[PDB]
Every structure is written in C-alpha cells, then in structure tokens.
C-alpha cells in the first residue's frame, strides 16, 4: 500500500509518501516562522505546499493519508471549522484553577495540567463566558485532517487524551459530556482507522484518487515512536536530543504526577513515557557538535572518568526523580576536556538508565532493547557507555522522522500492537 504521512511539528512540517511494498519513499518539507498572527493559515497553506511538492505520480498512488500534530495545540472553531480566535499552542499555559477540571477526569489524569487541551477549552469557556454548542475544539491534527475529509469534530485517542479522554475505558466521562463543554468534544477513533474519503475537490486539485482515505491522526512524539517500528512490549525508544526523552512500550499503563510520567494507549498496549531536563543542551553549554564529536572519538570507554555528574542545563529536574531545587552537578572540572566530556556522557547515561529503571519501578514491562533517536544516536562511544550501563541491546532507530511513523500509521494502523 502507498500511504502518505504528514507531520506538523514545533518548527515546521514534513510530508513523507511511502510505497511499503517496494519500501520506496519521498520526503518534502516546509519551515514555519518563529511567530505568526494567523497560525491556521500558516498550517493550512503548509498542508497545500506539502501536497504540491510531492510528485504527481506519487499522489496518483496514495491510498491513505494520516496527520500528526503537536500535543496541546488547539483551535476553537464554528461548525464549518472556521477558527473563532487565535489557536492556543502546545507550549502555552492557561491561568486556570485545575480544581475547575476535577469533576471531569480522574485525580491522576494527564489532562489535569495548565497546558492541556481541556484546560485551554475551559480557559476559552471563561473568556467567552458561554460557548455555543454548535462550535468545536480541534487539535492541530484534527483541524488539518478536517481540511481533507470535511468531517467535523473528529479526533484520535492520542490527541484527545489531554482533552479529558480516558482511553482505558474509551470515553469522555459522563460529567464532561453532560457539561457545558460536551457539545464541542470530538468523536474519538483509534489512530489509523479510516474517517472518510478525501473531499472530491481536494482530490481533483491535487491529483489524488477520489477513493483515497483520510485516517485518524496522532501526535508528533507518538509518530516519532511509530517511526522506529518497535511493536513488542519492553521495546523502547531513547531520544538523545536537547533533552533526553524515553518512551517504553508496555503491557501495563503507568503514571506519576510529579515526574510528568504517563501512558498513551497504543492498540492493546501502552506507550509509557518520561522526560529528563538533562540532554544535549547541557553538552552544548561546553562544546559545539564538531568539537563534541572530535572529543568523543578520543574517549576510552574502558576507563571511568571518576566524575559523578548530574548534567542539568539549569535548576530543576523532572524525571526520573522530581526535584525543582536540584542544581546542575558538574564538579570537579578536570584539566582534560576528554575526561570532562566522559563525565558528561556518563551522567546522561545514568539519566537514561535510571529513567528506564524508574518506568519499570512504576510497573512498566521490563526493558528488552533500545532504539536510539536524536543527535546523540550516532555517538558510538556514548552508545558503548549506555550499553555497558543498561545491559540491553542498543541500536540506532531505523527511522526517526515523525512523518514516516505517520505514514506507517496510515498504511497499517496500530494492528501490530496486540
């Protein structure tokens, strides 16, 4: 099957069309401005540009399309999908009392955060006083796919989670549905399942098959995990980016409020997650990528630095141990930059190790192997340290681009996760 994945991320958007029979693919991209006063037009136009850059003979073969978007980016629209105010972005927080959400979700629910879609919807409710029932709140992915299939109030149980959805029971609470916000809530499907055929005019304009199906979407981080192709419980993806982000596939859902750990539903499984403030950003405080790699090549992995670092970029750690007061621990500083770098990498390695240990201690399926993403993935010495410390097979992820994972989502759904 030839399928199209669309990734709308934090800095831009990418389209990947893939024939999963010949395993052949094509990828195109657009870049966002740092700031916009009309993000809906930016995203919509980006969608059209992405479609345009894809070769016509690829578009003529695309059978299924899926879209991932940033988690917490929402749009308040009318019944026609027309935005009634500026979107609230993923990284924006709303000055609301979380107690106002208490009767709508369980006590340990991930939606109980000032940056959640639910919190934002409530913020809008307060701002407007009363919201018309014919209106709708849509995730970025929801709205963008709405541009393609024309079905209003449609979402997935990944995006809908922080809107107040409970994927463990597959429903919004009765209280939330019966409330003054219920009519704006979307119909929730499993990511990957067909929502409806592409709109005729869109298909004609972009030379797509009129029978091309538009699927339920997902989030960009989940799509990133889906790119790896890991579908066995105990398999994990480590993102060695600016911050170290761990995602572990598990048969058991786990969560922890203070460390920000929670679990997405993933077919019959659960994707548990945890993010440390430690990461590449701490490394960039001392070395540029070039010098970082050149110095990395000189490290003897059989030695130990004798340094016990906790490489925070600044005050406060979230995961594996929540500590808002913890300062960066980078003393002492050896004269040798090689030993110093080794201390740093050892620290980050400890962060990863203790991270997966933490997820397991919360009840998650024990770790079997690591697929690595992010800029640190190709650091061989670092991978050696991680291998020695963690004790499971570690390799570079086959794919890391969210658009590819979303393409796989369109092609096969979540069928592999049972």
Tab-separated table of C-alpha atoms in Angstrom:
chain	number	residue	atom	x	y	z
A	1	UNK	CA	0.000	0.000	0.000
A	2	UNK	CA	1.162	3.523	-0.851
A	3	UNK	CA	0.498	5.857	2.067
A	4	UNK	CA	1.158	9.482	2.995
A	5	UNK	CA	2.286	10.706	6.398
A	6	UNK	CA	2.058	14.363	7.389
A	7	UNK	CA	3.995	15.686	10.388
A	8	UNK	CA	3.188	19.136	11.745
A	9	UNK	CA	5.872	19.810	14.330
A	10	UNK	CA	7.287	22.523	16.558
A	11	UNK	CA	9.328	24.264	13.851
A	12	UNK	CA	7.894	23.088	10.528
A	13	UNK	CA	6.012	20.426	8.590
A	14	UNK	CA	7.102	17.351	6.648
A	15	UNK	CA	5.370	15.051	4.175
A	16	UNK	CA	6.561	11.516	3.502
A	17	UNK	CA	4.934	9.387	0.817
A	18	UNK	CA	5.892	5.721	1.007
A	19	UNK	CA	5.284	2.612	-1.059
A	20	UNK	CA	5.570	-0.044	1.652
A	21	UNK	CA	5.729	-2.814	-0.931
A	22	UNK	CA	8.942	-1.648	-2.577
A	23	UNK	CA	9.891	0.233	0.598
A	24	UNK	CA	10.490	3.298	-1.552
A	25	UNK	CA	9.783	6.799	-0.270
A	26	UNK	CA	9.854	10.518	-0.990
A	27	UNK	CA	10.091	13.343	1.551
A	28	UNK	CA	9.365	17.078	1.360
A	29	UNK	CA	9.357	19.870	3.942
A	30	UNK	CA	8.231	23.392	4.787
A	31	UNK	CA	9.523	25.683	7.537
A	32	UNK	CA	7.391	27.740	9.926
A	33	UNK	CA	8.172	31.277	11.072
A	34	UNK	CA	9.044	31.663	14.759
A	35	UNK	CA	5.926	33.795	15.180
A	36	UNK	CA	2.583	34.212	13.420
A	37	UNK	CA	-0.644	36.130	13.977
A	38	UNK	CA	-2.522	33.656	11.783
A	39	UNK	CA	-1.296	30.129	12.530
A	40	UNK	CA	-4.344	28.458	10.932
A	41	UNK	CA	-3.462	29.960	7.548
A	42	UNK	CA	0.179	29.000	8.082
A	43	UNK	CA	-0.694	25.360	8.802
A	44	UNK	CA	-3.326	25.063	6.061
A	45	UNK	CA	-1.102	26.638	3.427
A	46	UNK	CA	1.749	24.416	4.631
A	47	UNK	CA	-0.534	21.432	4.029
A	48	UNK	CA	-1.181	22.571	0.461
A	49	UNK	CA	2.534	23.264	-0.208
A	50	UNK	CA	3.470	19.829	1.124
A	51	UNK	CA	0.918	18.249	-1.193
A	52	UNK	CA	2.221	20.336	-4.101
A	53	UNK	CA	5.878	19.354	-3.634
A	54	UNK	CA	5.024	15.636	-3.755
A	55	UNK	CA	5.489	14.209	-7.293
A	56	UNK	CA	2.246	13.752	-9.241
A	57	UNK	CA	2.838	10.056	-9.931
A	58	UNK	CA	3.201	9.552	-6.180
A	59	UNK	CA	-0.035	11.406	-5.448
A	60	UNK	CA	-1.837	9.260	-8.017
A	61	UNK	CA	-0.906	6.171	-5.995
A	62	UNK	CA	-1.548	7.446	-2.462
A	63	UNK	CA	-4.387	5.399	-0.960
A	64	UNK	CA	-4.330	6.522	2.683
A	65	UNK	CA	-3.295	9.733	4.447
A	66	UNK	CA	-2.599	10.418	8.118
A	67	UNK	CA	-1.631	13.548	10.058
A	68	UNK	CA	0.219	14.070	13.332
A	69	UNK	CA	0.318	17.398	15.148
A	70	UNK	CA	1.759	18.949	18.281
A	71	UNK	CA	0.072	17.874	21.517
A	72	UNK	CA	-1.929	20.682	23.111
A	73	UNK	CA	-2.209	22.891	20.050
A	74	UNK	CA	-5.943	23.500	19.763
A	75	UNK	CA	-8.354	25.593	17.700
A	76	UNK	CA	-11.788	26.869	18.683
A	77	UNK	CA	-13.933	26.734	15.547
A	78	UNK	CA	-17.548	27.052	14.429
A	79	UNK	CA	-19.494	24.267	12.712
A	80	UNK	CA	-17.676	24.984	9.429
A	81	UNK	CA	-14.278	24.565	11.073
A	82	UNK	CA	-13.613	28.303	10.989
A	83	UNK	CA	-11.394	29.495	13.890
A	84	UNK	CA	-13.172	31.910	16.239
A	85	UNK	CA	-9.965	33.072	17.923
A	86	UNK	CA	-6.197	32.550	17.883
A	87	UNK	CA	-5.027	28.964	18.462
A	88	UNK	CA	-3.602	28.057	21.860
A	89	UNK	CA	-0.218	26.495	21.147
A	90	UNK	CA	1.213	23.351	22.742
A	91	UNK	CA	3.716	25.271	24.867
A	92	UNK	CA	1.193	27.838	26.118
A	93	UNK	CA	-0.180	27.614	29.656
A	94	UNK	CA	-3.566	28.914	30.793
A	95	UNK	CA	-4.118	30.773	34.096
A	96	UNK	CA	-6.886	28.459	35.313
A	97	UNK	CA	-7.587	26.619	38.554
A	98	UNK	CA	-7.164	22.893	37.898
A	99	UNK	CA	-9.826	22.300	40.556
A	100	UNK	CA	-12.309	23.506	37.932
A	101	UNK	CA	-11.485	20.350	35.963
A	102	UNK	CA	-11.745	17.975	38.929
A	103	UNK	CA	-15.242	16.628	38.273
A	104	UNK	CA	-14.464	15.836	34.625
A	105	UNK	CA	-11.457	13.490	34.891
A	106	UNK	CA	-9.855	11.083	37.410
A	107	UNK	CA	-7.432	12.514	40.001
A	108	UNK	CA	-4.335	11.157	38.248
A	109	UNK	CA	-5.400	12.102	34.711
A	110	UNK	CA	-2.900	13.719	32.339
A	111	UNK	CA	-5.443	16.400	31.398
A	112	UNK	CA	-5.013	17.982	34.837
A	113	UNK	CA	-2.315	20.369	33.592
A	114	UNK	CA	-2.386	24.080	32.727
A	115	UNK	CA	-1.071	23.269	29.236
A	116	UNK	CA	-3.696	20.636	28.393
A	117	UNK	CA	-6.371	20.889	25.702
A	118	UNK	CA	-9.027	20.589	28.410
A	119	UNK	CA	-7.530	23.438	30.429
A	120	UNK	CA	-7.381	25.532	27.266
A	121	UNK	CA	-11.004	24.744	26.406
A	122	UNK	CA	-12.012	25.800	29.920
A	123	UNK	CA	-9.944	28.970	29.521
A	124	UNK	CA	-11.911	29.693	26.353
A	125	UNK	CA	-15.164	28.965	28.185
A	126	UNK	CA	-14.255	31.569	30.805
A	127	UNK	CA	-13.045	34.028	28.165
A	128	UNK	CA	-16.260	33.839	26.123
A	129	UNK	CA	-18.484	33.289	29.159
A	130	UNK	CA	-20.585	30.734	27.301
A	131	UNK	CA	-19.612	28.735	24.214
A	132	UNK	CA	-22.240	27.830	21.575
A	133	UNK	CA	-22.890	24.057	21.376
A	134	UNK	CA	-22.516	24.035	17.577
A	135	UNK	CA	-18.865	25.037	17.953
A	136	UNK	CA	-15.934	22.634	18.280
A	137	UNK	CA	-12.447	22.311	19.729
A	138	UNK	CA	-9.947	20.656	17.403
A	139	UNK	CA	-6.351	19.540	17.805
A	140	UNK	CA	-3.911	20.740	15.139
A	141	UNK	CA	-4.011	17.273	13.568
A	142	UNK	CA	-7.822	17.196	13.841
A	143	UNK	CA	-8.243	20.520	12.044
A	144	UNK	CA	-5.691	19.695	9.363
A	145	UNK	CA	-7.288	16.318	8.587
A	146	UNK	CA	-10.645	18.115	8.652
A	147	UNK	CA	-9.272	20.116	5.741
A	148	UNK	CA	-9.029	16.794	3.877
A	149	UNK	CA	-12.141	14.786	4.810
A	150	UNK	CA	-14.558	17.537	5.861
A	151	UNK	CA	-15.935	15.638	8.855
A	152	UNK	CA	-16.277	17.985	11.815
A	153	UNK	CA	-15.455	17.102	15.431
A	154	UNK	CA	-13.219	14.125	14.639
A	155	UNK	CA	-10.155	13.165	16.674
A	156	UNK	CA	-7.999	10.293	17.947
A	157	UNK	CA	-7.404	8.909	21.430
A	158	UNK	CA	-3.835	10.190	21.412
A	159	UNK	CA	-4.679	13.860	20.866
A	160	UNK	CA	-7.918	13.563	22.850
A	161	UNK	CA	-6.145	12.239	25.961
A	162	UNK	CA	-5.261	15.669	27.336
A	163	UNK	CA	-8.701	16.910	26.288
A	164	UNK	CA	-10.046	14.651	29.032
A	165	UNK	CA	-10.437	11.369	27.182
A	166	UNK	CA	-9.900	8.119	29.080
A	167	UNK	CA	-8.532	5.593	26.549
A	168	UNK	CA	-8.568	2.835	29.181
A	169	UNK	CA	-12.370	2.959	29.076
A	170	UNK	CA	-12.536	4.662	25.671
A	171	UNK	CA	-14.835	7.537	26.618
A	172	UNK	CA	-15.099	11.056	27.916
A	173	UNK	CA	-16.608	10.999	31.406
A	174	UNK	CA	-20.383	11.317	31.699
A	175	UNK	CA	-19.867	14.556	33.641
A	176	UNK	CA	-17.743	16.094	30.887
A	177	UNK	CA	-20.167	15.098	28.125
A	178	UNK	CA	-23.150	16.367	30.135
A	179	UNK	CA	-21.359	19.635	30.871
A	180	UNK	CA	-21.369	22.937	29.000
A	181	UNK	CA	-18.311	21.764	27.042
A	182	UNK	CA	-19.569	18.369	25.879
A	183	UNK	CA	-21.052	19.533	22.579
A	184	UNK	CA	-17.640	20.819	21.490
A	185	UNK	CA	-15.934	17.489	22.181
A	186	UNK	CA	-14.967	15.304	19.190
A	187	UNK	CA	-15.795	11.741	18.208
A	188	UNK	CA	-12.726	9.715	19.142
A	189	UNK	CA	-11.321	6.934	16.960
A	190	UNK	CA	-8.227	4.757	17.093
A	191	UNK	CA	-5.236	6.347	15.316
A	192	UNK	CA	-5.018	4.859	11.824
A	193	UNK	CA	-8.650	3.920	11.194
A	194	UNK	CA	-10.403	5.477	8.204
A	195	UNK	CA	-12.544	8.526	8.968
A	196	UNK	CA	-13.885	9.074	5.469
A	197	UNK	CA	-12.922	9.507	1.809
A	198	UNK	CA	-10.952	12.560	0.709
A	199	UNK	CA	-13.028	15.564	-0.367
A	200	UNK	CA	-13.677	15.397	-4.152
A	201	UNK	CA	-12.459	18.927	-4.942
A	202	UNK	CA	-9.246	18.392	-2.954
A	203	UNK	CA	-8.588	15.096	-4.740
A	204	UNK	CA	-9.171	16.754	-8.117
A	205	UNK	CA	-6.996	19.772	-7.349
A	206	UNK	CA	-4.043	17.754	-6.086
A	207	UNK	CA	-4.474	14.787	-8.415
A	208	UNK	CA	-5.233	12.278	-5.681
A	209	UNK	CA	-7.509	9.260	-6.029
A	210	UNK	CA	-11.103	10.178	-5.107
A	211	UNK	CA	-11.144	6.914	-3.138
A	212	UNK	CA	-8.149	7.937	-1.030
A	213	UNK	CA	-8.987	7.533	2.647
A	214	UNK	CA	-8.202	10.035	5.396
A	215	UNK	CA	-7.352	8.292	8.671
A	216	UNK	CA	-7.499	9.284	12.326
A	217	UNK	CA	-4.298	11.078	13.287
A	218	UNK	CA	-1.886	11.092	16.220
A	219	UNK	CA	0.712	13.261	17.972
A	220	UNK	CA	4.215	14.088	16.746
A	221	UNK	CA	6.041	12.337	19.609
A	222	UNK	CA	3.962	9.186	19.243
A	223	UNK	CA	4.545	9.319	15.489
A	224	UNK	CA	8.256	9.586	16.258
A	225	UNK	CA	7.951	6.361	18.244
A	226	UNK	CA	5.963	4.757	15.412
A	227	UNK	CA	8.814	5.528	13.015
A	228	UNK	CA	11.021	3.026	14.863
A	229	UNK	CA	8.654	0.165	14.053
A	230	UNK	CA	9.001	-1.326	17.533
A	231	UNK	CA	5.803	-3.157	18.485
A	232	UNK	CA	6.910	-5.687	21.111
A	233	UNK	CA	6.370	-4.822	24.804
A	234	UNK	CA	9.651	-3.998	26.525
A	235	UNK	CA	10.994	-2.313	23.409
A	236	UNK	CA	11.917	1.331	23.897
A	237	UNK	CA	12.971	4.433	22.005
A	238	UNK	CA	15.534	6.769	23.540
A	239	UNK	CA	15.653	10.282	22.114
A	240	UNK	CA	19.054	11.769	22.882
A	241	UNK	CA	18.067	15.304	21.915
A	242	UNK	CA	18.363	18.646	23.704
A	243	UNK	CA	16.515	16.847	26.475
A	244	UNK	CA	16.606	13.081	26.985
A	245	UNK	CA	13.196	11.564	26.271
A	246	UNK	CA	12.362	7.918	26.998
A	247	UNK	CA	9.440	6.009	25.501
A	248	UNK	CA	8.768	2.440	26.618
A	249	UNK	CA	6.236	0.010	25.155
A	250	UNK	CA	4.451	-1.826	27.953
A	251	UNK	CA	1.598	-4.234	28.647
A	252	UNK	CA	0.856	-2.153	31.732
A	253	UNK	CA	-0.135	1.513	31.889
A	254	UNK	CA	1.871	3.561	34.379
A	255	UNK	CA	1.771	7.175	35.523
A	256	UNK	CA	3.360	9.550	38.015
A	257	UNK	CA	2.183	13.122	38.537
A	258	UNK	CA	5.323	14.824	39.821
A	259	UNK	CA	7.694	13.272	37.269
A	260	UNK	CA	5.271	14.009	34.438
A	261	UNK	CA	5.156	10.329	33.512
A	262	UNK	CA	2.052	8.984	31.805
A	263	UNK	CA	0.931	6.454	29.207
A	264	UNK	CA	-0.769	6.693	25.823
A	265	UNK	CA	-2.970	3.857	24.628
A	266	UNK	CA	-1.316	2.036	21.729
A	267	UNK	CA	-3.593	-0.684	20.404
A	268	UNK	CA	-3.714	-3.358	23.083
A	269	UNK	CA	-0.524	-1.947	24.576
A	270	UNK	CA	0.564	1.241	26.335
A	271	UNK	CA	3.332	3.686	25.471
A	272	UNK	CA	4.755	4.904	28.770
A	273	UNK	CA	6.960	7.988	28.781
A	274	UNK	CA	9.403	10.098	30.764
A	275	UNK	CA	11.476	13.198	30.012
A	276	UNK	CA	14.588	14.455	31.798
A	277	UNK	CA	15.773	18.062	31.731
A	278	UNK	CA	19.259	16.659	31.104
A	279	UNK	CA	20.364	16.274	27.488
A	280	UNK	CA	22.223	17.716	24.517
A	281	UNK	CA	21.611	21.283	25.697
A	282	UNK	CA	23.935	20.708	28.651
A	283	UNK	CA	26.546	19.408	26.207
A	284	UNK	CA	26.193	22.494	24.000
A	285	UNK	CA	26.986	24.638	27.035
A	286	UNK	CA	30.569	23.386	26.772
A	287	UNK	CA	31.099	22.005	23.259
A	288	UNK	CA	29.751	22.623	19.736
A	289	UNK	CA	28.733	19.486	17.801
A	290	UNK	CA	32.043	19.365	15.898
A	291	UNK	CA	34.287	19.560	18.955
A	292	UNK	CA	31.825	17.292	20.768
A	293	UNK	CA	32.292	14.514	18.210
A	294	UNK	CA	36.044	15.011	17.805
A	295	UNK	CA	36.440	14.791	21.586
A	296	UNK	CA	34.045	11.839	21.746
A	297	UNK	CA	36.331	9.866	19.431
A	298	UNK	CA	39.173	10.196	21.948
A	299	UNK	CA	37.280	8.763	24.922
A	300	UNK	CA	38.409	5.374	26.211
A	301	UNK	CA	35.148	3.619	27.185
A	302	UNK	CA	37.035	1.021	29.257
A	303	UNK	CA	38.106	3.789	31.640
A	304	UNK	CA	35.951	5.654	34.133
A	305	UNK	CA	36.160	9.439	34.470
A	306	UNK	CA	35.931	9.388	38.254
A	307	UNK	CA	33.368	12.149	37.835
A	308	UNK	CA	29.865	11.850	39.282
A	309	UNK	CA	27.910	14.376	37.223
A	310	UNK	CA	24.231	15.188	37.049
A	311	UNK	CA	24.244	17.176	33.777
A	312	UNK	CA	21.291	19.519	34.264
A	313	UNK	CA	21.314	22.586	31.985
A	314	UNK	CA	19.775	24.596	34.820
A	315	UNK	CA	17.989	24.262	38.168
A	316	UNK	CA	15.253	21.654	38.499
A	317	UNK	CA	14.769	18.068	37.370
A	318	UNK	CA	11.501	16.434	36.308
A	319	UNK	CA	12.415	12.794	35.658
A	320	UNK	CA	13.415	10.159	36.808
A	321	UNK	CA	13.340	11.983	40.160
A	322	UNK	CA	11.299	15.164	40.526
A	323	UNK	CA	13.424	17.845	42.185
A	324	UNK	CA	12.660	21.513	41.394
A	325	UNK	CA	15.595	22.684	43.529
A	326	UNK	CA	18.333	20.396	42.204
A	327	UNK	CA	21.236	22.381	40.754
A	328	UNK	CA	23.477	21.190	37.905
A	329	UNK	CA	26.190	18.954	39.368
A	330	UNK	CA	29.292	19.300	37.207
A	331	UNK	CA	32.139	19.419	39.739
A	332	UNK	CA	35.004	18.974	39.690
A	333	UNK	CA	36.282	20.227	36.334
A	334	UNK	CA	39.328	18.233	35.201
A	335	UNK	CA	42.055	19.908	33.131
A	336	UNK	CA	41.419	17.346	30.399
A	337	UNK	CA	38.395	18.125	28.167
A	338	UNK	CA	38.244	14.439	27.192
A	339	UNK	CA	37.756	13.299	30.796
A	340	UNK	CA	35.257	16.129	31.311
A	341	UNK	CA	33.218	15.056	28.286
A	342	UNK	CA	33.382	11.470	29.527
A	343	UNK	CA	31.951	12.653	32.839
A	344	UNK	CA	29.119	14.383	30.992
A	345	UNK	CA	28.275	11.350	28.844
A	346	UNK	CA	28.433	9.097	31.912
A	347	UNK	CA	25.972	11.447	33.601
A	348	UNK	CA	23.499	11.400	30.710
A	349	UNK	CA	23.879	7.621	30.511
A	350	UNK	CA	22.965	7.403	34.197
A	351	UNK	CA	19.937	9.573	33.444
A	352	UNK	CA	18.799	7.095	30.761
A	353	UNK	CA	19.474	4.029	32.938
A	354	UNK	CA	17.701	5.423	35.995
A	355	UNK	CA	14.937	6.587	33.675
A	356	UNK	CA	14.072	3.140	32.367
A	357	UNK	CA	14.580	1.787	35.878
A	358	UNK	CA	12.063	4.382	37.085
A	359	UNK	CA	9.489	3.450	34.457
A	360	UNK	CA	9.899	-0.212	35.412
A	361	UNK	CA	9.548	0.598	39.125
A	362	UNK	CA	6.229	2.256	38.290
A	363	UNK	CA	5.081	-1.118	36.969
A	364	UNK	CA	6.004	-0.979	33.288
A	365	UNK	CA	7.050	-4.010	31.238
A	366	UNK	CA	10.792	-4.691	31.787
A	367	UNK	CA	13.194	-3.278	29.191
A	368	UNK	CA	14.260	-5.592	26.348
A	369	UNK	CA	16.117	-3.349	23.884
A	370	UNK	CA	16.771	0.285	22.943
A	371	UNK	CA	16.303	2.021	19.611
A	372	UNK	CA	18.051	5.383	19.688
A	373	UNK	CA	16.997	8.691	18.149
A	374	UNK	CA	18.207	12.288	18.364
A	375	UNK	CA	21.613	13.816	17.684
A	376	UNK	CA	23.357	11.574	20.199
A	377	UNK	CA	22.196	8.385	18.481
A	378	UNK	CA	25.247	8.141	16.224
A	379	UNK	CA	27.725	8.735	19.060
A	380	UNK	CA	29.445	5.340	19.214
A	381	UNK	CA	31.362	5.833	22.475
A	382	UNK	CA	28.199	7.103	24.141
A	383	UNK	CA	26.323	4.052	22.870
A	384	UNK	CA	29.054	1.873	24.369
A	385	UNK	CA	28.655	3.570	27.752
A	386	UNK	CA	24.869	3.197	27.561
A	387	UNK	CA	25.211	-0.466	26.576
A	388	UNK	CA	27.565	-1.172	29.474
A	389	UNK	CA	25.350	0.638	31.977
A	390	UNK	CA	21.906	-0.580	30.897
A	391	UNK	CA	22.617	-4.155	29.796
A	392	UNK	CA	20.174	-4.487	26.907
A	393	UNK	CA	20.809	-4.442	23.136
A	394	UNK	CA	21.060	-0.890	21.804
A	395	UNK	CA	20.878	0.188	18.164
A	396	UNK	CA	20.078	3.265	16.091
A	397	UNK	CA	16.387	3.554	15.208
A	398	UNK	CA	15.675	2.535	11.578
A	399	UNK	CA	13.578	5.686	11.181
A	400	UNK	CA	13.138	8.786	13.331
A	401	UNK	CA	11.053	11.188	11.228
A	402	UNK	CA	7.524	11.577	12.602
A	403	UNK	CA	6.076	11.830	9.080
A	404	UNK	CA	7.332	8.309	8.363
A	405	UNK	CA	5.741	6.907	11.510
A	406	UNK	CA	2.548	8.673	10.497
A	407	UNK	CA	2.861	7.131	7.029
A	408	UNK	CA	3.107	3.723	8.690
A	409	UNK	CA	0.070	4.730	10.746
A	410	UNK	CA	-1.883	5.415	7.567
A	411	UNK	CA	-0.654	2.185	5.979
A	412	UNK	CA	-1.150	-0.319	8.807
A	413	UNK	CA	-2.776	1.466	11.744
A	414	UNK	CA	-1.958	0.039	15.175
A	415	UNK	CA	-2.565	-3.594	14.194
A	416	UNK	CA	0.985	-4.614	15.134
A	417	UNK	CA	0.331	-3.660	18.766
A	418	UNK	CA	-1.560	-6.729	20.008
